[PDB]
RNA sequence: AACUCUAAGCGGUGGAUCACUCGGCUCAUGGGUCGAUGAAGAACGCAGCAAACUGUGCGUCAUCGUGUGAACUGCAGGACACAUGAACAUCGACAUUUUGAACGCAUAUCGCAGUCCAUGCUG
RNA sequence: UGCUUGGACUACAUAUGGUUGAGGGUUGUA
RNA sequence: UGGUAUGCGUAGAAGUGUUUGGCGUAAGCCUGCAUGGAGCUGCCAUUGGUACAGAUCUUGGUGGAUAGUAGCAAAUAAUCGAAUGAGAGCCUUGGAGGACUGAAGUGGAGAAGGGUUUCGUGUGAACAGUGGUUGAUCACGAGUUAGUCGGUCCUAAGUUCAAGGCGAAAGCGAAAAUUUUCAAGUAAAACAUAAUUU
RNA sequence: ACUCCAUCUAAAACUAAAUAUAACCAUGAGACCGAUAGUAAACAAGUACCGUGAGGGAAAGUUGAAAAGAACUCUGAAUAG
RNA sequence: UUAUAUACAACCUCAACUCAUAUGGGACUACCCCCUGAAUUUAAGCAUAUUAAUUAGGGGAGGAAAAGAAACUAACAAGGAUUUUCUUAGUAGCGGCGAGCGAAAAGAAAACAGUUCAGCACUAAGUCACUUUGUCUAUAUGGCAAAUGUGAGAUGCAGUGUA
């Protein structure tokens, strides 16, 4: 961080991510796009939107359980996905907390909003390659 | 005159140097005392100056110069525009009035070397500072 | 809001609008000399400036 | 016998709830607050009582109006409306 | 402004009490008992009851709850039977 | 007292509301420090006094 | 060195005056009033809970020596002289077992290097490889407490490349771990002899 | 035997020690932004479930406008109004109680007037 | 009018403008 | 803390218990074994809030006294005994029965005070220096309706303070109380409007 | 005191910058402390609590990767085992 | 007018307005401008002294404050507002000349910036606040224009111009 506005300080950075207002929480709760989707759109990553199909690259599942996000629970910093649940002693199937920084987005919801953001990501993709 | 110490008639609790009551005198002139009193009642007018007309025994007669900063004549007219600035709010208590400036004792030079360098509080502070340069 | 704008358009063209239409900025700022009445210069200062305005020159080798 | 017995005849409230601060410190007989100088212009905020100022200060309350003044300064106290650069038509 | 009238017929009557003892007083004594605003001067209560629910009010007796709320016991004219009116307000 | 001034009655009335044991479903919150209502003023344990 | 001081008001908040003996409890100052269980409880001592330490750290604590003009320069020149002499350089570490020459001079074309990849290609052939590899592998999480202070740890100061003219040398060089660039004008003693250990 | 002494193993008791920390502390840097246009502070009532913290004022855990674009979440009423918008920020439009400089006069009384405009009832 | 409810007003010091005023202060017309 | 051992490390760090083995005159060190879970150390230089047994030290914890020794003893003080429950001398309670205060009350009301303590229901741990199913406990609900009783109103002792002033101001350990008519005023008109009234 | 010289022009008024900053707002660092420490307060902290009042004013951080916070059966009124 | 004989027009001075229009109070209080103002302590006791023109108290402002174009500093080959820093200086000097206290000038630097009434013959008050209406147009206590309408002002204001 070369510019004077700028916290490297450990305590300050921890304020930011833990106490994150929900819009910063979306950024944090982004997941990288699948290798497929990277060819199509030329987009690294997108911030999880409810119908997104997901494969968990880590723990216990490490490849597959091709399922759709129920809700992004931003205050828990956790994403719950349909079909991915842990057996409780009381037989109650409760969702496994899956961070989106473990995940590939396999399928992207298209809205006019969602496309515009993919397009922003498309346009900046040209620039630093140029540099 | 003499600003007789508000003492309980109990003797002033300490050292004999502090035992004078009635020979103890204002470090502020009677010009300024006239101004400060007017200024609290008339907080909306800003006081430039005070001059004397007459004096017998118990009282001293002053005419005090008051300005309306909220009157657009006095906003209006360029020479006196600067008095409308919020810096001049109650000059009298800060002795930016002529009466107050003299009591605070700010003359260039030597007869006032202490206190001209710093206004009267300020001079003390400079002198009694250990200026510690980093690279000692 | 429809009352508020109704009041604004009536008090528009009219000096000394009701206290709540007056830009509640801060107390100090309101009383702090309108821009016209700060720029005001004595007739003499206009002469001084008129002939001699600080002109953008240079020094040296 | 005025020992515990001195406690036993204590029934007459010397102080009632402050109109200024609710700190229950207003002297009935003198009609004056200890601490908060009860309706005599000044709150008695002593610089010897550093802790007293600490209680009485901004930040112990919600600071309702003055907090909004801070953000408006950065806005340079503008009356108007920003509105919307692009469409954005509300129809069903 | 001018600032709109801050005690409408609505605001005056917040709720009907509906407590077990209150319901008995509808049955027996032909009273409809309401939670009211602490600003409601009895004569507010009469006016509001008359206007909202069509009922001729005979007398109103007012209590303050230890829950910092008012109870208004509204006596109805013998032309109007309570229990029908309570169930017009929809509450058994 | 025994017939309490209206100002007093309002302050005491608010105090009665405080004396309630915390809803037990609030205790189950993520980063919930609240085990109990702990400011429960029981009148012969903690007055209001003075 | 950035000034740390203990709060000057810390342990002086407490109004505590000390109970004279006969009180059957020790001399030290004790917190007045009632029922908080801070009262009264142990105040003001360096030997007390919540009480201020003897010698409380003060911001007037001397950071800097002004070092004699000739003296630091002497150290600097001595450092440059050590930068040749292969035994000294081996002594500090720096895996230089198969290096082209000491004192290692390379073409001025080195300065022009816009890109990090291009830089590494040069350096390795020029015989940096083992010493640059000495860096990156060694990065390790700080043992202290020092980890919280942003003092994440020490990793290997591999090579000091010196340039007369920055034609894009610095930006390319900045990235690569433990590799530092200096100008001939500035020639830092810290960079030439890190830890006072001669033989960069 | 039991007990006591001495040592050791195991279990208690107790919270030292270690390692962590959305906090504290101190130095540096940018800015000047309370108030009779009714402050700071206090009191009071407010969440579907809250009693506080926190937020807010009677439009009460918040409203316009604006930004983003789908949560909140303990349980849920809700979730819908995700494409005109959640929710959080922005917050420039409004609201902003009873007070407090505190302003009709008072205040072990939320007590008691006067005045203008206005409403219902009776006439 | 009676009876009843809501809103807005009614502190003090003080400048200026407004008009009413006032004093064997003092001037003049009669 | 700078440097370094291309140090160690979740395949178990640090910490710590330890009749592991050993080193040093010692300060102290290493290692084993068990526990552990997330980070750590040696060496050379560099700085200190740097090593504890004490200070009638501080703060927290814990013993012997003492699973019980003081005691839990004033107002005699129960008791038969039905019901219930996990348990019941009291406390839960009837019936019964011994008595108590002995209407100058341990009664029946209120102020001053208390602040939900009142009351129903549920009723366990903690509390009732004992038990305790019961309670002023703990949990859950309800309840304090007035033209005529008080507050209100009124004045008292006395006070808050607008004054001419005085004070460093605030304020006056002040009743200052002076302030055009500071005054109360008419269901009243003619010429200072016309009576009175500080 | 006398005799001179030099030097300004009081008893009036306006005026940036360098200069201060333990508060406030917006920020960045530390050979800072690491829960008897550090601010009084890492936490419903100027809180709970005491005192008529002024004031005095704490103790108290940590399950785990995930609550997966021990279903079920049994003994026990039950807490527990 | 003025003996109580009325009426009108002025000036001065003081009242009455819930008058038209405005303003002050209070807080915050790190920094700062003033007023006001100790003692512990040191002197091995103790009073002057010291602590100290400091704590406490109270009023008032700003982003800095205050200060500010010298009734200066000097004695020169003078320099040239103010502020601060470096220096002088632990010194000139003060002081039971005990304890202890003590600055400025020149010299160096940071940053720099200058000025104006009022008092002379403008000599057709050249000036100004307000109230209304034209216009303008902020969301104005605004500017333009008209009434040449009140009022201020020769008991004095414009304006050259400030040693």
Swiss-Prot record, chain B:
One of its GO terms (biological process) is cytoplasmic translation. Residues 117-136 are annotated as: Disordered. It comes from the Eukaryota. Disulfide bonds: none annotated. Keywords: Ribonucleoprotein, Ribosomal protein. Residues 122-136 have a biased composition (Basic residues). GO terms for molecular function: RNA binding; structural constituent of ribosome. GO terms for cellular component: cytosolic large ribosomal subunit; cytosolic ribosome. Belongs to the eukaryotic ribosomal protein eL15 family. This is Large ribosomal subunit protein eL15. It comes from Drosophila melanogaster. The chain holds residues 69 to 204 of 204 of the full protein.
Swiss-Prot record, chain D:
One of its GO terms (biological process) is cytoplasmic translation. SUPFAM superfamilies: Zn-binding ribosomal proteins. It comes from the Eukaryota. Keywords: Metal-binding, Ribonucleoprotein, Ribosomal protein, RNA-binding, rRNA-binding, Zinc, Zinc-finger. The keyword Endoplasmic reticulum does not apply. PROSITE patterns: RIBOSOMAL_L37E (PS01077). Binds to the 23S rRNA. This is Large ribosomal subunit protein eL37A. The gene is RpL37-1.
Swiss-Prot record, chain F:
InterPro entries: Ribosomal_eL39 (IPR000077), Ribosomal_eL39_CS (IPR020083), Ribosomal_eL39_dom_sf (IPR023626). GO terms for molecular function: structural constituent of ribosome. Keywords: Ribonucleoprotein, Ribosomal protein. The keyword Ribonucleoprotein applies. One of its GO terms (cellular component) is cytosolic large ribosomal subunit. Belongs to the eukaryotic ribosomal protein eL39 family. This is Large ribosomal subunit protein eL39. The lineage of its organism: Eukaryota, Metazoa, Ecdysozoa, Arthropoda, Hexapoda. The gene is RpL39.
From Swiss-Prot, chain G:
Belongs to the universal ribosomal protein uL4 family. This is Large ribosomal subunit protein uL4. It comes from Drosophila melanogaster. The chain holds residues 52 to 251 of 401 of the full protein.
């Amino acid at each position: 961080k070369q510019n004077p506005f700028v916290s490297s300080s450990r305590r300050k950075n921890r304020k930011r991510h833990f106490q994150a207002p929900s819009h910063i929480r979306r950024r944090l709760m982004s997941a990288p796009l699948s290798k497929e989707l990277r060819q199509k759109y030329n987009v690294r990553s997108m911030p999880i939107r409810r119908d997104d199909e997901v494969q968990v690259i880590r723990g216990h599942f490490k490849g597959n359980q091709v399922g759709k996000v129920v809700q992004a629970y931003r205050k828990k910093f956790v994403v719950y996905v349909e079909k991915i649940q842990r057996e409780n002693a009381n037989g109650t199937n409760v969702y496994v907390g899956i961070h989106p920084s473990k995940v590939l987005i396999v399928k992207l919801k298209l809205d006019k909003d969602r496309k515009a953001i993919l397009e922003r990501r498309g346009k900046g993709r040209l620039a630093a390659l140029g540099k | 005159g003499g600003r007789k110490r508000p003492v309980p008639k109990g003797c002033t609790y300490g050292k004999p140097k502090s035992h004078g009551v009635n020979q103890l005198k204002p470090y502020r002139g009677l010009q300024s005392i006239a101004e400060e009193r007017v200024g609290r009642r008339l907080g909306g007018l800003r006081v430039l100056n005070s001059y004397w007309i007459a004096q017998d025994a118990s009282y001293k007669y002053f005419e005090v110069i008051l300005i309306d900063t909220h009157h657009s004549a006095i906003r209006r007219d360029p020479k006196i525009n600067w008095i409308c600035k919020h810096v001049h709010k109650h000059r009298e208590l800060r002795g930016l009035t002529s009466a107050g400036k003299s009591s605070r004792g700010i003359g260039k030079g030597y007869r006032y070397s202490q206190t001209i360098g710093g206004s009267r509080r300020a001079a003390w502070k400079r002198k009694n500072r250990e200026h510690m340069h980093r690279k000692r | 809001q429809k009352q508020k704008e109704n009041l604004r358009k009536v008090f528009k063209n009219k000096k000394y609008k009701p206290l709540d239409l007056r830009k509640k900025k801060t107390r100090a700022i309101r009383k702090a000399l309108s821009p016209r009445d700060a720029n005001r210069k004595t007739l003499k200062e206009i002469r001084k400036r008129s002939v001699f305005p600080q002109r953008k020159f240079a020094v040296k080798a | 016998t005025k020992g515990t017995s001195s406690f036993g005849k204590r029934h007459n409230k010397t102080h009632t709830l402050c109109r200024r601060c609710g700190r229950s410190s207003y002297h009935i007989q003198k009609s004056t607050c200890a601490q908060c100088g009860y309706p005599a212009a000044k709150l008695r905020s002593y610089n010897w009582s550093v802790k007293a100022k600490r209680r009485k200060t901004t930040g112990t309350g919600r600071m309702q109006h003055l907090k909004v003044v801070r953000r408006r300064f950065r806005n340079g106290f503008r009356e108007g409306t920003q509105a919307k650069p692009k469409k954005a038509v509300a129809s069903k | 402004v001018p600032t709109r009238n801050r005690m409408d017929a609505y605001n005056i009557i917040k709720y009907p009490l509906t407590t077990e003892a209150a319901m008995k007083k509808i049955e027996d004594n032909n009273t409809l008992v309401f939670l009211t605003h602490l600003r409601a001067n009895k004569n507010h209560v009469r006016a509001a009851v008359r206007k909202l629910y069509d009922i001729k009010v005979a007398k109103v007796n007012v209590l303050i709850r230890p829950d910092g709320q008012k109870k208004a016991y509204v006596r109805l004219a013998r032309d109007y039977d309570a229990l029908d009116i309570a169930n017009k307000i929809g509450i058994i | 007292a025994a017939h309490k001034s209206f100002r007093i009655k309002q302050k005491l009335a608010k105090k009665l509301k405080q004396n309630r044991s915390v809803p037990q479903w609030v205790r189950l919150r993520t980063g919930n420090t609240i085990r109990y209502n702990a400011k429960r003023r029981h009148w012969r344990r903690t007055k209001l006094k003075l | 060195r950035q000034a740390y001081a203990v709060s000057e008001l810390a342990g002086h908040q407490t109004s505590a005056e000390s109970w004279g003996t006969g009180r059957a409890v020790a001399r030290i100052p004790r917190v007045r009033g009632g029922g908080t269980h801070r009262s009264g409880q142990g105040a003001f001592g360096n030997m007390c809970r919540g009480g201020r330490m003897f010698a409380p750290t003060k911001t007037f604590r001397r950071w800097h020596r002004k070092v004699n003009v000739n003296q630091r320069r002497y150290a600097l020149v001595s450092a440059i002289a050590a930068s040749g002499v292969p035994a000294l350089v081996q002594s500090k570490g720096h895996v230089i077992d198969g290096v082209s020459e000491f004192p290692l001079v390379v073409s001025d074309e080195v300065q022009k290097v816009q890109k990090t990849k291009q830089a590494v290609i040069f350096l390795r052939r020029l015989k940096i490889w083992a010493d640059i590899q000495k860096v990156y592998k060694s990065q390790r999480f700080r043992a202290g407490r020092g980890t919280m202070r942003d003092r994440r740890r020490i990793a290997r100061r591999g090579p000091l490349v010196v340039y007369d003219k920055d034609e894009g040398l610095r930006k390319a060089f900045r990235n690569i771990p433990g590799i530092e660039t200096i100008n001939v004008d500035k020639l830092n003693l810290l960079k030439l002899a890190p830890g006072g250990h001669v033989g960069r």
